[PDB]
Swiss-Prot record, chains A, B:
Species in which this protein is naturally found: Homo sapiens (Human)
Parent-protein start and end of this portion: 391 to 558 of 580
Self-association state and partner proteins as the record states: Interacts with MAPK14 and 14-3-3 proteins.
Protein name: M-phase inducer phosphatase 2
Record's comment on post-translational modification: Phosphorylated by BRSK1 in vitro. Phosphorylated by CHEK1, which inhibits the activity of this protein.
Entry's localization field: Cytoplasm, Cytoskeleton, Microtubule organizing center, Centrosome; Cytoplasm, Cytoskeleton, Spindle pole
Phosphoserine PTM positions: 83
Family label: Belongs to the MPI phosphatase family.
The organism's taxonomic lineage, starting at the top: Eukaryota, Metazoa, Chordata, Craniata, Vertebrata
């Protein structure tokens, strides 16, 4: 029912979803992420942003193509809400996809934060980003199945030994 | 019952195990792999070999420390059975651990193959390698959790686009 309705209750979620940890959030599989990246929804989706919520060194060691790195809430808020990324056609959808390494904590968290700020600067139902998803499994599950959609085509875990300082510096 | 006994039915499996796909095989977690690598079983385990059953390009892009790359059955048979890696102390055990990228196919098969060859060159209960395990999740699960125990500290998936020919060649 209303379970499939997006942020402004105007319509159902466009993408097929899968079971995820957080019940209040919608999850998509690596496969759906590829379909989106290869234009299978080009007539319906006007724009989509992939928000890598991992820290800079993780992102720099290999991320999904076109993804933007926004680890801090102020960065995310600034990039997504200071100057709202509207559609080139008010008939088309704008979709946001969040993920981190495992898409367990940092990702889902950033997703809720943005929804809060979005509600704050709008007239209740209306949202700049009514449709948002979490990439299930994060980079850890996506990279090995579709390395060709990543760049550089590598993977640097948050636990990587050569960035322990950068890690706590970011904590 | 005999399910908890090793190949020659002489004693129980030394390492704690976890549920894995193949019921005929014993699986260990990344955590147990680390305990073994850091000497937590040095008084009981005389020697252990980690057999990376992935293809050379995968191995070269990042593998577990001390692991040997034996993708082909002839390589594995030659390295492990042409000149049996016996213990320095008869009281001590020799353990083998197989894994591939996800540890669902290549690794388990190599593990079964070696057990067959081992049975072939012995008097029934006896085996050169009575105790063997599968690293659950393979390199995919181990690398992100313990990158410091891998070298180079990177990850090259079997699907890495720049190695499509080598994959075919090895197929």
């Amino acid at each position: 029912g209303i379970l499939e309705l997006i942020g402004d209750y105007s319509k159902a979620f466009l993408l097929q979803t899968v079971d995820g940890k957080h019940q209040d959030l919608k999850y998509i599989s690596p496969e759906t992420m590829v379909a989106l990246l290869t234009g299978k929804f080009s007539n319906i989706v006007d724009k989509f942003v992939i928000v890598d919520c991992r820290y800079p060194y993780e992102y720099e060691g290999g991320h999904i193509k076109t993804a933007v790195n926004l680890p801090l809430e102020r960065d995310a808020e600034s990039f997504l809400l200071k100057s709202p990324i509207a559609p080139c056609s008010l008939d088309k959808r704008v979709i946001l996809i969040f993920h981190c390494e495992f898409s367990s904590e940092r990702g889902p968290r950033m997703c809720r934060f943005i929804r809060e700020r979005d509600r704050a600067v709008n007239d209740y139902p209306s949202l700049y980003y009514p449709e948002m998803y979490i990439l299930k499994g994060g980079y850890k599950e996506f990279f090995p199945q579709h390395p060709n959609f990543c760049e550089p085509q590598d993977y640097r875990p948050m636990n990587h030994e050569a960035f322990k300082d950068e890690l706590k510096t970011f904590r």
